[PDB]
């Protein structure tokens, strides 16, 4: 039949892709980097302990100022922290308790969050009389909000457990673009620095590269055995790192269109919750379900450092734009700044 033919043609097409990828595997990243000096053991201490949330922290995000940062907890609040002094700038009681993701706008004027409400709630910080209030509630997803990132103050991109991502026009609250393709809950996304592209990681154990403007998927990276919980771009935007329930992080190059590296160890069985690169991209930081964040040599895949402080799962992490510090958020209701 016609339907059988397209099942077949899609199978031959999947091989043609694998083969084309094998055709480029002339060397490995590990061979290439086999020469250069290892990084040495990274020795970060806890500078700040950010105390305030009354329950599990589910997510965080740094301001572009490398100082202010927003956080979303099970206690149904968002806190915008001055990391330098530990002073809370704002504490924001949310209209839903089931928050999972938060984001800080590039300008530092708006912030966003959402979760099982199925809504991306945008919050203007500099209101006309000192207060904070919801400027917009972006509604359209038929599943929970897994993640969300501003393009600018007028545009934002969301991922959802309805297996889609979306681009919104904040002024009008419209759903400009939908990024259908994933076959499972989308769990995380990362914007390319150009912000013409972004990637998504999902419970179908695949990552995807999407063109923002064109609104379609360019490339699909598979490899992980389990759900992909986190994802971050390499600083040059030619590659990205993923972290999964499979206890491994992985590095995918876009132009080679395949996996370059796997970051793992036999003493790590538990899953990765979050990933972030250091400013140069040489270090890959990963937060784990065993309460530690591990610091990885992105080029040699040796475990370099281990951030051990938190008493429960590290649910989220982030490196500053000036690259001075690492924030880590946790189920123990604390955020810590490492340096």
């Amino acid at each position: 039949s016609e339907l059988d033919q397209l099942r077949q043609e899609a199978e031959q097409l999947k091989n043609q892709i694998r083969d084309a990828r094998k055709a480029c595997a002339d060397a490995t990243l590990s061979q290439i980097t086999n020469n250069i000096d290892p990084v040495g053991r990274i020795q970060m201490r806890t500078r700040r302990t950010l105390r305030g949330h009354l329950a599990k922290i589910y997510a965080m995000h740094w301001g572009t100022d490398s100082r202010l940062l927003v956080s979303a907890s099970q206690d149904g609040k968002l806190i915008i922290w001055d990391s330098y002094t530990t002073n809370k700038v704002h504490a924001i009681p949310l209209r839903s308790s089931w928050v999972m993701t938060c984001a800080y706008a590039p300008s530092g004027n708006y912030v966003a969050c959402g979760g099982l409400d199925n809504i991306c709630s945008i919050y203007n910080l500099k209101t006309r009389e000192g207060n904070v209030r919801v400027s917009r509630e972006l509604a359209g997803h038929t599943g929970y909000l897994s993640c969300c990132r501003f393009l600018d103050d007028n545009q934002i991109v969301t991922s959802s457990g309805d297996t889609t991502c979306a681009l919104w026009d904040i002024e009008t609250g419209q759903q400009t673009t939908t990024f259908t393709g994933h076959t499972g809950d989308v769990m995380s996304l990362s914007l390319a620095p150009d912000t013409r592209l972004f990637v998504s990681g999902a419970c179908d154990a695949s990552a995807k590269l999407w063109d923002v403007r064109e609104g379609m998927c360019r490339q699909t990276f598979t490899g992980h055995e389990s759900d992909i919980n986190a994802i971050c771009f390499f600083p040059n935007g030619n590659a990205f790192a993923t972290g999964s329930d499979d206890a491994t992080c992985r590095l995918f190059d876009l132009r080679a269109d395949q996996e370059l590296m796997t970051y793992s160890h036999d003493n790590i069985i538990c899953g990765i919750t979050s990933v972030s690169f250091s400013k140069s991209g040489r270090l890959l930081l990963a937060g784990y379900d065993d309460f530690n964040c591990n610091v990885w040599d992105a080029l040699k895949a040796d475990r370099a450092g281990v951030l051990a402080g938190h008493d429960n799962r590290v649910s989220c992490l982030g490196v500053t734009d000036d690259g001075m510090a690492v924030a880590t958020g946790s189920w123990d209701s604390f955020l810590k700044i490492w340096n």
Binding site: L13, I17, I32, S280, G281, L299, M324
Partner: protein, 59 residues
């Protein structure tokens, strides 16, 4: 999912994914490494910055 439209949409997608230009892994990796070496001097977590520069140690 006996959707003929849905099947067509997958196939044509797998073309978009298949028919691209790929570079060799060795070229890809070399470019990555060349980046990390270029910006290694601009990464505080990679290199020792004095307390004077660091806005966290002694304030």
């Amino acid at each position: 999912t006996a959707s003929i439209a849905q099947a067509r949409k997958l196939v044509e997608q797998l073309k978009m994914e298949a028919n691209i230009d790929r570079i060799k892994v060795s070229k890809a990796a070399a470019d990555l490494m060349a980046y990390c070496e270029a910006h290694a001097k601009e990464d505080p977590l990679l290199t020792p910055v004095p307390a004077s520069e660091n806005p966290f140690r002694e304030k």
